[PDB]
Enzyme design. Sequence first.
Site, PDB file in Angstrom:
ATOM      1  N   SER A   1       0.803  -1.225   0.000  1.00  0.00           N
ATOM      2  CA  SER A   1       0.000   0.000   0.000  1.00  0.00           C
ATOM      3  C   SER A   1       0.831   1.269   0.000  1.00  0.00           C
ATOM      4  CB  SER A   1      -0.994   0.048   1.197  1.00  0.00           C
ATOM      5  OG  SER A   1      -2.039  -0.924   1.013  1.00  0.00           O
TER       6      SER A   1
ATOM      7  N   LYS B   1       0.196   3.900  -2.719  1.00  0.00           N
ATOM      8  CA  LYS B   1      -0.991   4.763  -2.768  1.00  0.00           C
ATOM      9  C   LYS B   1      -0.654   6.242  -2.651  1.00  0.00           C
ATOM     10  CE  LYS B   1      -3.742   0.872  -1.447  1.00  0.00           C
ATOM     11  NZ  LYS B   1      -4.282   0.009  -0.290  1.00  0.00           N
TER      12      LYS B   1
ATOM     13  N   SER C   1      -5.631   2.622   3.934  1.00  0.00           N
ATOM     14  CA  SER C   1      -5.206   1.598   2.962  1.00  0.00           C
ATOM     15  C   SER C   1      -6.397   0.935   2.269  1.00  0.00           C
ATOM     16  CB  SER C   1      -4.354   0.502   3.653  1.00  0.00           C
ATOM     17  OG  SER C   1      -3.053   0.989   3.955  1.00  0.00           O
TER      18      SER C   1
ATOM     19  N   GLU D   1      -5.389  -3.831  -6.957  1.00  0.00           N
ATOM     20  CA  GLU D   1      -5.635  -4.498  -5.702  1.00  0.00           C
ATOM     21  C   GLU D   1      -6.641  -5.604  -5.981  1.00  0.00           C
ATOM     22  OE1 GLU D   1      -3.511  -2.042  -2.774  1.00  0.00           O
ATOM     23  OE2 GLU D   1      -4.208  -4.106  -3.030  1.00  0.00           O
TER      24      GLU D   1
ATOM     25  N   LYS E   1       3.074   6.452   5.286  1.00  0.00           N
ATOM     26  CA  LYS E   1       2.151   5.502   4.663  1.00  0.00           C
ATOM     27  C   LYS E   1       2.776   4.120   4.831  1.00  0.00           C
ATOM     28  CE  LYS E   1      -1.127   3.800   2.294  1.00  0.00           C
ATOM     29  NZ  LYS E   1      -1.246   2.918   3.477  1.00  0.00           N
ATOM     30  N   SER E   2       1.999   3.211   5.399  1.00  0.00           N
ATOM     31  CA  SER E   2       2.449   1.817   5.638  1.00  0.00           C
ATOM     32  C   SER E   2       1.978   0.907   4.552  1.00  0.00           C
ATOM     33  CB  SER E   2       1.891   1.361   7.011  1.00  0.00           C
ATOM     34  OG  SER E   2       0.490   1.441   6.996  1.00  0.00           O
ATOM     35  N   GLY E   3       2.566  -0.275   4.526  1.00  0.00           N
ATOM     36  CA  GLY E   3       2.071  -1.317   3.666  1.00  0.00           C
ATOM     37  C   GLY E   3       2.268  -2.677   4.283  1.00  0.00           C
ATOM     38  N   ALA E   4       1.389  -3.592   3.908  1.00  0.00           N
ATOM     39  CA  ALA E   4       1.525  -5.025   4.327  1.00  0.00           C
ATOM     40  C   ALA E   4       1.144  -5.875   3.118  1.00  0.00           C
ATOM     41  CB  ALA E   4       0.537  -5.286   5.534  1.00  0.00           C
TER      42      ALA E   4
END
Lengths: 165, 263
Positions: free
Chosen positions: B45, B48, B105, B141, B209-212
Amino acid sequence: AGVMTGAKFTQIQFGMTRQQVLDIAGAENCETGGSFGDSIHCRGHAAGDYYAYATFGFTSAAADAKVDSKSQEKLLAPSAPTLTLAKFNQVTVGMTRAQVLATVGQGSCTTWSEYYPAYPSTAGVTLSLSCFDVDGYSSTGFYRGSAHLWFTDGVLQGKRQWDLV
Amino acid sequence: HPETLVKVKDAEDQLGARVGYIELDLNSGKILESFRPEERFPMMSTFKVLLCGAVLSRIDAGQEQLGRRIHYSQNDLVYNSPVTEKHLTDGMTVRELCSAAITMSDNTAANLLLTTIGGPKELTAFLHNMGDHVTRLDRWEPELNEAIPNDERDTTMPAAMATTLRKLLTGELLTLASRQQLIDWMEADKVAGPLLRSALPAGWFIADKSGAGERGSRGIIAALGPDGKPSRIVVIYTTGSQATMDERNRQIAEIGASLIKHW
């Protein structure tokens, strides 16, 4: 009483007040306003992006509004998931909910959302099911074989799948 | 600081997976510290932010409006979409979609915005034109989170992402209003609490901004600084670990604790 859970989700009923929702979910887990408008959104096991949750929709913004929508992701596990790509392709638009369940497996689905836009009338009810292959569901929020089946007035209007084999 | 590099390396041993790291000076663009800066990692993510940068570029060109409402439907929905699922009967504006994509997200919001710009291919073209010749989005996605080892789809390099973020937040690439909107969304991030923010002392600024993803993939991009203003960009990615989410979060927090210490 812990974070939001499948059990709390199932306990909450259409027609309930905001206060009943907050009392069952545990108010600490919940929010309204901001991104969520009139609704009450309750967080489960989080961990970051893609955390489990429920959202409850209300008839109006009024403090005395009633629950007219229930939605969740990653709170409910399918009881016997047996969906496959084959079975998904056998589902056809115009099928009833019963016909669809007979095609995908009686235990393959959970309710993603259910909304009564004419509450208290049930006319025009919309229902989205999340349906899973044998290993597709995960409470960690990454699925490996799932589908979205959506209905109006109990009749299938469409379908989509990711990663079925 | 060399010490932070010790922590990044420790993280790799503990997770049993490669970790990439960059700390960049926001003003000068100079690399302060780095680890595996030119290896590829899945963006998850974190892409984004780049997406909403491309949308804001369209708005600057008069080709898009923040207040424009998009009306979508059940066929558009994908899972992990807490905001877009709620707004199904009455639409969301482009401003609301970028807020949901960045701060929550939201996967459907991201796909809807990808549609507005012409898809993953067009985001990659935008990136190339901005001088980022490495970062690529290929899929929509939820598939872009697959993290197949050595699969270059939907990847970036720590150094490329850091420099790209710096240009989105400080160049004349975007107008000032658009740079402010992008960093305001990132500052309002709601889902990155267990990461850098958990190490951040009162008074500091952070927009992130995080992502997994699958296969233990986790990452974060951030602009942060003391006394309420950002002054460095930090990028951390990892992929391939079997460690739990909490465990992966904890390593990222600790890298954060160290660069904070040795600032």
